[PDB]
Amino acid sequence: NKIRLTNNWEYLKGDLGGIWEAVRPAAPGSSEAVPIWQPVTLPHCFNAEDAVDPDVNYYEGPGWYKTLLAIDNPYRNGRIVLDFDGAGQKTDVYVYTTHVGSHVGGYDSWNVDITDAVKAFLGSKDAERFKGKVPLSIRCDNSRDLEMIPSDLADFNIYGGLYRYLNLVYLPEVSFEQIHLESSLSSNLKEGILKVKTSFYNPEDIRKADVTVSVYDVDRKPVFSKTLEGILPLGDQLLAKMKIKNPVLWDVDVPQLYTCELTVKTPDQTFTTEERFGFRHTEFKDKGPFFLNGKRLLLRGTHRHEDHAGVAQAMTEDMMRREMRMMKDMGVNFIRLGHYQQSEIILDLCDELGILVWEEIPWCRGGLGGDVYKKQARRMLANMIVQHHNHPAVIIWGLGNENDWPNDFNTFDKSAIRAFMKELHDMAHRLDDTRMTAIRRCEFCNDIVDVYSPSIWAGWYRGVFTDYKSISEQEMQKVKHFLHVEWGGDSHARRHSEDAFYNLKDGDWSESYVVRLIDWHLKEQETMPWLTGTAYWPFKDFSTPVRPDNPVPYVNQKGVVERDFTPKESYYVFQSYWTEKPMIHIYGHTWPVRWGGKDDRKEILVYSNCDEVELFVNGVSQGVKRRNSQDYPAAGLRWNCVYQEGMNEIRAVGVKKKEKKEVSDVIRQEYQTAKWDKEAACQVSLLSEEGDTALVQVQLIDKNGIRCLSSKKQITFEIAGDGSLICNLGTSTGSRKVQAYNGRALIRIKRNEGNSVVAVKSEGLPTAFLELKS
Amino acid sequence: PAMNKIRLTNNWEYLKGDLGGIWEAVRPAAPGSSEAVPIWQPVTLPHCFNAEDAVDPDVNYYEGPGWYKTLLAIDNPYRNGRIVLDFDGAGQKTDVYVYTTHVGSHVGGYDSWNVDITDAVKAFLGSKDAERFKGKVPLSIRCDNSRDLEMIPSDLADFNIYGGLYRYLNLVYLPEVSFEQIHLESSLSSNLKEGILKVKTSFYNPEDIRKADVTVSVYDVDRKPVFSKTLEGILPLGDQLLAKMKIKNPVLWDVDVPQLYTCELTVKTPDQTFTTEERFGFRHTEFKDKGPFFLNGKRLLLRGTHRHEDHAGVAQAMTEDMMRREMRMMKDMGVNFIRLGHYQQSEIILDLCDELGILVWEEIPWCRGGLGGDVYKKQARRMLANMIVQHHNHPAVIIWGLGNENDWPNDFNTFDKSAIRAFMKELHDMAHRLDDTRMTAIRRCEFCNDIVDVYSPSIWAGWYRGVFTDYKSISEQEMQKVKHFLHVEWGGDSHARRHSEDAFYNLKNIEAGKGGDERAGDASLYGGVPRASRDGDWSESYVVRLIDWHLKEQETMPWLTGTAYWPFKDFSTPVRPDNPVPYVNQKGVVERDFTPKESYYVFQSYWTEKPMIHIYGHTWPVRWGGKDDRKEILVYSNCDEVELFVNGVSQGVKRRNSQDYPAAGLRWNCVYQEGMNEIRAVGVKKKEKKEVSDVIRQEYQTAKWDKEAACQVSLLSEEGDTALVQVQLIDKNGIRCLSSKKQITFEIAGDGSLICNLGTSTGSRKVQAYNGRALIRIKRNEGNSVVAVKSEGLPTAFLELKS
Ligand code: NA
Ligand code: NA
Ligand code: NA
């Protein structure tokens, strides 16, 4: 009875003078026919393009959506509900000219019952001009607001618009507003307890209903069924309490769920819905590690923001499924869901894929606001816990991030922050004492929460990455339960560096440095039995408004995957440590030209979970090596080999004995011995073409025509004519202003079956041109 | 007072969009921090949010909040003085902050207002926060032109509701005692031989000084004194009548000899001497019942125009120099009357009307939509009172307007004629309570035509309705409906540089005799009955003939008060995205950058005595027709006789006679030779004993053209770093398509930039061709570029520009 409203919407950037402007009669070419609206499909985000456009501040302000709804309720005397998965940031909802609901909060789910407004509209003289449909107009507003969380100091876009699914939901008279499955598993894992509680939605005040509660195991076999006859379907009710002996356990390697099926019956309705849950025991050891179902489990974590190339926050379910599968295939078993509550599609995927969850409210930097600010934080914390309570994946409710970060107010009061942090902590425990509270980086609050994360960015923002174990050990001693969220480093995808390698005769923001940093962290974690776990920050490159000068402007490039899902070299480092499915990856798939002296022995890294690997350079074996994680780097699978000036073929063959499987990888790399002077010119060429799209390549060269392989110079693309740049993707090959990667830059052009001229600019160099014909 | 009044033009920054709170404007911000975004833009005031996006063809103009910030160096020269921010005008809702303290707010984009910031400045400079600003005072200003149905004007209006600090913002230092208001009440006796002046003032006296010596001096046009009096020991608090005097045989203000008096007031204490001045004029005005208009006892035909505060490159943020040039251009065209668009305009404009001799109708922006609630009504009342109080002393003003097209509905889901009448009568009564020496007026609200003193209907003959030859008869019918008839708004659009051999070609379906009023749908380019606004080619050739006809008819309308053409200069409007210049109302006789159109000279030839002569077609390079066709040549001149020469051969002398339409008898029918022709006209004006001449060169093309097939693009000229690029549409055989109106799109890639978004036919990156041609300038930036030229269904063409 749930209908995703995706088609037949129009969008207007900016505010209207009042709801009448959205629904008034408008003749073509009249004053009412401007401003001009844009047809869109939902989900939609205001900032799909301007978040990463290098020349503008992303839009923070009001915008409007409008559609015409075809209403046909299948239930007698039923309800019509608009169910928002999420919308940013302040939203107001109108049926014709009537305000029917509002919400402040960009990340929690909420809904509006429009039954009465629809009836009144359809019964009015105004309904005729809409020809049987009902006009729905929605205002979303992501204006900057110091008294609203999150803070504009945060390292992510505070996006605007209907960027998660909006559903039309038909209901009978009596339905469920919330279903809470309170499940607990004893330490000995042999007794599970389930309490089935619900909150009824009952606007007609039906006095009695028959409610059936049925519970099915992972194989869909019934383990409990009971009908409560003549229950009062009003407010909160405990429906069932049961003990399940030897329940099937939820685990990160074998995620298995139970299903609770609830039916509400009256003479006028039979309504069934279901909710999943899982049995699992979790324990944080005092000054010790983390245990799932009585066994120590090292949390192998990442993070994600709701952000994607081309769409900003408006990701589809299919995009979310692909991303979460990519994480699972990398070996992830833990995720902190960025700085806010995320789509329930994500939480369902964590339940189904076996990924434990830390989910937090966006009280993220700035200090502490007034009464409205505090009320929003309380409301979003309660909403998050109430809404996501049943997911077995969730082990931590987070209360905030970097709350020691000041300057959203002219005062900063540590004591007021502590007092409010303890209030939130106490509230979380009243709502759900089966999970741990946590925060990240607020040392003066580290005594308040159950689980604490400091800031540890060894080898990126401070120190060297060989400091990682020492800092983690020191920090774990300061708190009862330590869990390290956020670490890593930026890499401009397709930029590599010889300086990062141990070459035989350190590249920050290259992929070459970050693979070594990740490699080191993961091998250290094999020697830290006291460690709960960590979460790398983030899985995927994402846009941020506070980094206009990054190699990709306005993108945090610490991901191991590009903003369009393209894996970086660092993805395979994690995969080689964290998975058993045999794989093998020679570093440098996107590294076309290496460099150095003629007789240099160049370091070659292979990231593989195979037991032994043989490397071949230009067909000549360089010997077999056995994998050994502690033999850093590359877990012993490294070689130092001479490259030929010119083209080289590097091949690796690995075997994994347990799987009895052999796998191979091959790359081609040029080797350049010529040294280069400063950049002198841009050489522009058509690299390839596929259908209507052309791939254009830029190479920076010096006054003698030598490739400037260490150049990071910014390159600007422009086009005039029939085609268009495929730009503003937030990727190193989808950016019209981008730093070179080893003196190179690529961009794709949509030719539109016509002719164009591309111009390539770089400061102080002559502008270059490339003709593109169809 | 110029010595005390400082225009704050430099060292501002501008942010499009809102802040989360005043703290974001003044908080410490390190480079590369989160506080360092969003990025602000350095600007010089005056500034308008919409300088570019109002005419940009691909976006809706921005209606929303924006911020300005500066650091003020404060040094009050007066002991215990006041510090005031004086706004000439800002759009539309404005909030003012000194550091974190809100010190003032205003709703209304067109009235002047001020804020005393003395105490906030003192409190800031004495605080611990002052140190980090190094002796300067942070001033942050939020301006907001968000759409708002409960604020006038309406977004249904045919002009941009602009945002920003688009008129001068002044820093004003005052001593303890100053003048808050100076009101000069002047009246002129029956025989024009006795003038009466009452000098009234309101004091600004926050320190409660008990006594002052006040001098009142009145000076004539030479700034020599005709009256002087010192009031010793007056109470400088509240209102005081300072002087009442009778001037025998006063010098009269007239449209041909504008002469002003100046009233100079000085207030002295032991601690101060403060002088300010205000100008005024003596003149008698009378609207005759069912009759014409009299200035100083003689009938004066009002020869009128309108203007919007809007200009190429700057939107509403015009400088004083730009305003001076525009008003001088009007005066040189023969204008003696102006209706100042739909709102109060800069006091610079009013001062120029006083000095140049241009009578004024000025109105509040209650412009379309119906009628809002209590806040809406309070704003209209406030802006009416502000306009009358602020502009009361200008002798140019004869009419306070109460609104325009108030019969135009749909800003509300109700439209109540009785409520509109009740509020209209309240405004009318307020105007007369404040200033009974002037007439009230409205335009186009027939169900209110009994309320105001002076009424204008809608008469757009030959444009939005009917044919322009019905102009006089429609005017005759309309004038009989009201006591005092005054026709404001008429004319037609012309795409500058577009001309036509047959100006009446596609005007066959238009029906005469059934009115000339603009009704609902007429302004749109779609639907509706046939009308030149929709069916005309929008050539200058049509509007020149439409204007010519109107002006010669007015010489035979002795009962007519006068008229005002709409407008003087092309201006941007948000409701016309599909115009030949997108988002520009092209009815002006001057382009949006001050370039005169051919229609400017039609008015000038009818309305001025200074000898001039203008052959029609200065911007018409290629005429066309059959071999040996006799082509019509029009000359617009105020000379008594004109001789025309075509290729050196005299075509005979013709005598000027306004009623011998068209061109007042100064027309010839001459053969052009295929190729280039030189047309020369020599006129003599007997009264001045002066001879003047004009010359143009035109090509003549006999080849017929097929449909447009290609765009031929060339470098036409270059000047320094600027290149002039020309597009010519040609058919499959290479013949110029001289009647093409096809839209041309310019793009550039490389070092240069298009000189576009000017709202002119040669400054638009998307523009309809004028006789198959399109021009645009490129700033080369001393580098290399490729220009692309697109047109629907035609191959895109390219031009390389090297430096
Ligand atoms: Na941006
Ligand atoms: Na905020
Ligand atoms: Na526009």
Ligand code: NA
């Ligand atoms: Na309005």
